[PDB]
Symmetry: D2
Subunit: 97 residues, 4 copies
């Protein structure tokens, strides 16, 4: 349901991690910045599992946005708001090439 361009834009900037890591706040993260639930036992995932978690995270935020902005029907503005929150809400790491 998200545009392929919105998904490519987030993947232009969000790195992929196939192994889980602790972020600055000590929470476990994996894939494209996916925060794991408290009981999750996995350490590694596949690229397809990471893609599914990214779609899960984007669609969850879309459903909850709908409920904050009930009259907002412009899908462009929904996607840009979601990409904005994704960029503010996820810690990324510096890369010197």
């Amino acid at each position: 349901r998200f545009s392929s361009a919105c998904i490519a834009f987030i993947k232009q900037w969000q790195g992929l991690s196939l192994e889980k890591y602790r972020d600055r706040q000590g929470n476990w993260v994996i894939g494209y910045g996916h925060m794991l639930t408290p009981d999750e036992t996995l350490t590694f995932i596949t690229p397809d599992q990471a893609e599914a978690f990214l779609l899960d995270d984007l669609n969850s935020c879309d459903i909850l946005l709908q409920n904050c902005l009930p009259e907002l029907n412009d899908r462009f503005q929904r996607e840009t708001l979601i990409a904005l929150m994704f960029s503010i809400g996820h810690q990324r790491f510096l890369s010197l090439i």
Copy 2:
């Protein structure tokens, strides 16, 4: 939950209707831009009820931020995101 200044900023611009009205995009709205649900059968409310609907609506935006920005610990940025979304997501009155 929200600062009095954040709430006042939203009321400076949103504007109150104690009677329901059909806004520019065809939805029934009341209070401070609150979109009516089919279980909300009142077409006239008190200012206290208008404020309570506003806090529900801001809480809906807070739920979004708690789930999609779970590590945001900057209350100013939280509040500015909520005000921005309220301004884009609700239509103006008059």
Copy 3:
């Protein structure tokens, strides 16, 4: 200046008109939602001219961020702010 993915995201949604048209709020627009100035006398442009106007319009948003977020060194956040502002600030085509 802007990533190809950021540009593609804006083109996925904005939509191209090689002919000028009066948008929903009454302004003359052309290309990818580019608002005409009185010195822009063409009413028909090439796709290359449409892309050049888009890069001017994104540069106007970049000038805003360079002056009002001068310490922002997160290109992703820069680009998401630019796309959000483009989506709120330009009307859709069809």
Copy 4:
């Protein structure tokens, strides 16, 4: 020209400094997060001077926003975008009471 409520909202959260300081990037800042120009010689300012710099910063961003969002006429959305940029664009400091 900005609403008193927009100005009070930014002052609810942005602290006032009457003396200049170096931010994380080594730039000089004073007042309500006002970045000083390269040649400025002042070290201290008054609260009225800080207020004028805040209005200067808000109105500069308004003029440049106008030029990025030429069709945006809703003053509420202009003010919220400006407050958002102000909160993202300025470093603030932790206060334990």
